[PDB]
Amino acid sequence: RQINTEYAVSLLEQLKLFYEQQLFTDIVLIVEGTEFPCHKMVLATCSSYFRAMFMSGLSESKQTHVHLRNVDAATLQIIITYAYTGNLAMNDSTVEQLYETACFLQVEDVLQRCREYLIKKINAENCVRLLSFADLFSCEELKQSAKRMVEHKFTAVYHQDAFMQLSHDLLIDILSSDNLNVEKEETVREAAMLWLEYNTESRSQYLSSVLSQIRIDALSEVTQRAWFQGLPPNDKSVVVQGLYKSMPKFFKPRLGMTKEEMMIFIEASSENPCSLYSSVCYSPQAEKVYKLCSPPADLHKVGTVVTPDNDIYIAGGQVPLKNTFRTVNCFYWFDAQQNTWFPKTPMLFVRIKPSLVCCEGYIYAIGGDSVGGELNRRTVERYDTEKDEWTMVSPLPCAWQWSAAVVVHDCIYVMTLNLMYCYFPRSDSWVEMAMRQTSRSFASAAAFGDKIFYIGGLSVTVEIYDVNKNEWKMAANIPAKRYSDPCVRAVVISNSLCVFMRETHLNERAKYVTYQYDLELDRWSLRQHISERVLWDLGRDFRCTVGKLYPSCLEESPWKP
Amino acid sequence: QKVDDDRKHEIEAAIVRIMKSRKKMQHNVLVAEVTQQLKARFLPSPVVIKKRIEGLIEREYLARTPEDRKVYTYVA
Numbered sequence A: 001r002q003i004n005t006e007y008a009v010s011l012l013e014q015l016k017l018f019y020e021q022q023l024f025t026d027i028v029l030i031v032e033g034t035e036f037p038c039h040k041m042v043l044a045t046c047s048s049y050f051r052a053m054f055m056s057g058l059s060e061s062k063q064t065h066v067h068l069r070n071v072d073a074a075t076l077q078i079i080i081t082y083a084y085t086g087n088l089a090m091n092d093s094t095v096e097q098l099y100e101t102a103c104f105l106q107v108e109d110v111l112q113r114c115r116e117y118l119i120k121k122i123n124a125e126n127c128v129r130l131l132s133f134a135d136l137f138s139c140e141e142l143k144q145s146a147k148r149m150v151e152h153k154f155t156a157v158y159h160q161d162a163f164m165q166l167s168h169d170l171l172i173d174i175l176s177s178d179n180l181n182v183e184k185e186e187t188v189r190e191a192a193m194l195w196l197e198y199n200t201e202s203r204s205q206y207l208s209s210v211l212s213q214i215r216i217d218a219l220s221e222v223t224q225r226a227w228f229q230g231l232p233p234n235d236k237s238v239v240v241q242g243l244y245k246s247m248p249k250f251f252k253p254r255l256g257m258t259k260e261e262m263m264i265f266i267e268a269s270s271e272n273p274c275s276l277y278s279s280v281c282y283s284p285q286a287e288k289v290y291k292l293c294s295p296p297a298d299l300h301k302v303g304t305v306v307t308p309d310n311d312i313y314i315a316g317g318q319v320p321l322k323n324t325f326r327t328v329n330c331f332y333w334f335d336a337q338q339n340t341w342f343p344k345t346p347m348l349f350v351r352i353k354p355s356l357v358c359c360e361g362y363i364y365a366i367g368g369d370s371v372g373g374e375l376n377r378r379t380v381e382r383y384d385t386e387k388d389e390w391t392m393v394s395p396l397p398c399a400w401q402w403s404a405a406v407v408v409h410d411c412i413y414v415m416t417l418n419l420m421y422c423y424f425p426r427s428d429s430w431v432e433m434a435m436r437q438t439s440r441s442f443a444s445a446a447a448f449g450d451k452i453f454y455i456g457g458l459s460v461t462v463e464i465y466d467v468n469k470n471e472w473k474m475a476a477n478i479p480a481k482r483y484s485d486p487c488v489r490a491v492v493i494s495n496s497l498c499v500f501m502r503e504t505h506l507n508e509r510a511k512y513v514t515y516q517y518d519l520e521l522d523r524w525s526l527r528q529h530i531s532e533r534v535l536w537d538l539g540r541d542f543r544c545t546v547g548k549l550y551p552s553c554l555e556e557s558p559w560k561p
Numbered sequence B: 001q002k003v004d005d006d007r008k009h010e011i012e013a014a015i016v017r018i019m020k021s022r023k024k025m026q027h028n029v030l031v032a033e034v035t036q037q038l039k040a041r042f043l044p045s046p047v048v049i050k051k052r053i054e055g056l057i058e059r060e061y062l063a064r065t066p067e068d069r070k071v072y073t074y075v076a
Helices: A007-021 A040-046 A050-055 A073-085 A095-105 A108-119 A126-136 A140-157 A168-176 A186-197 A204-214 A223-230 A237-243 B002-018 B030-037 B046-053
Strands: A027-031 A034-038 A065-067 A260-269 A277-282 A289-292 A303-306 A312-315 A331-334 A341-343 A355-359 A362-366 A380-384 A389-392 A404-408 A411-415 A420-424 A429-432 A444-448 A451-455 A462-466 A471-474 A490-493 A496-503 A511-518 A523-530 A543-549
Touching: A007 A073, A027 A073, A034 A040, A034 A073, A040 A050, A040 A073, A073 A095, A095 A108, A095 A126, A108 A140, A126 A140, A126 A168, A140 A168, A168 A186, A168 A204, A186 A204, A186 A223, A204 A237, A260 A303, A303 A355, A303 A543, A312 A362, A355 A404, A355 A411, A362 A411, A404 A444, A404 A451, A411 A451, A444 A490, A490 A543, B002 B030, B002 B046, B030 B046
Parallel strands: A027 A065
Antiparallel strands: A027 A034, A260 A277, A260 A543, A277 A289, A303 A312, A312 A331, A331 A341, A355 A362, A362 A380, A380 A389, A404 A411, A411 A420, A420 A429, A444 A451, A451 A462, A462 A471, A490 A496, A496 A511, A511 A523
């Protein structure tokens, strides 16, 4: 057995003290003129290269002074102090050089630590840079993670400066993969072209290879004429090899074209009695019901948000203590292809059913039972999708419960029983808007166009608000059978305002049906009635949100009609 | 001339009644709102409103400093 409360701590601390006092040292590392006196035992036990450096019989084994080059002084110093104390204390800037020096010195523990730190920090921009870094220094985990992040984001950016400087093999792997998140086939063509326009006559063979890779569907559009404009003179066989890429090489449809606009539902009626809730999806066009994996698989009462880039996030929630419902501030993100949930930076307060709002690329969590004992029981907390951190902002004016919040015209709007405040993120200030004449709670609002549609409350209250008109007005009442409790759900569908409502009576079964609403008609025309043969009962605490998903990655929910 | 002066005072009255409970403007943010509020009244007259909004900087009550346009004085 290994001790950890007696000799281990004392031995490590005494070794650190000996290192500080320059005692019992027999080897000194020379790094561009900087001296690092240390011990051979610690270097042998930490690094897998120093053990061969001092054990294998050569001229440097019996050498008091060793001139080690191609290593940074600060990185070697931090590696030595980690070996002498066990604490790494890595920043976010010197990770690349630290990993390079760890790979050169073959220090497995710090290599794993840096690998985890890098795989956790593929946020938005270093994806291609760290992908190239992992291609240079073989790292399967980093390579796969960066490949997936690139397939997700570069397919929407395809203009990064670092992306231009990539090796042929990595670019071939990226382009030939069927994970490109592109709704059109010309964007990848123009990305490949611009990758082959800044460096031409140098990668002409690789130009032909990428030309073949992009395949006929985009090869038959403009590439021939642009190449004729840009071909080197006295090139004949290149024309012959380029003309050949018209018939062969298995023209097949891509995967990114399957961005069907669907509805993500959470906390549904679980088919199995072992489970309590489940997350499922519905297809407005395919008329099918898909399922999703629960992010924690045990925690419920979560809030949903969808960014303009079609991303799904989960924050807050409560989980049973499983002693022999505790609130957790954990955060999660849904993978559009792996059908899993990768966690992210947790929150600072354990919220219950938080309301997350996206604006200016930032996620804003408004209310949702943060604490309560704080002097200002009316506070908020936002998220940074780029820096991956939580920043405190101006708190709420008034404390509200069972509230709803949306975003309109790049402005934060939160709706409560009767009041509404317009938070302006740029000035971090709250603007008093208008007050509703009806006091209704337990309802949600939808941000369709430039008008906020607060639907329901306790009912069928349809109160329409306009940012420009700054006024609340009524339109009509949704045609709902009497003696019923309509679970109204308002959300945008295909750039058209629609609703998803369910009616329940006494000794009667629930019915699901969505209606098409018109702005000037003030009527909910019958758009589609959801048949019970494909969709079963959902419940009462279910939530609805609009997002695009992949049918192949997800799986259909089995249920008897 | 009388109706021009009437419009010139009406726009100032609107801008001092509305922006006293609204947000700020960096380059051309609040002018769109003030034109939308007056869309049903008359033409926006961009040059007239642009020349008139910069005349109030000589004194207090939302001077709207051009160099310090990052934040406006939300005071009386």
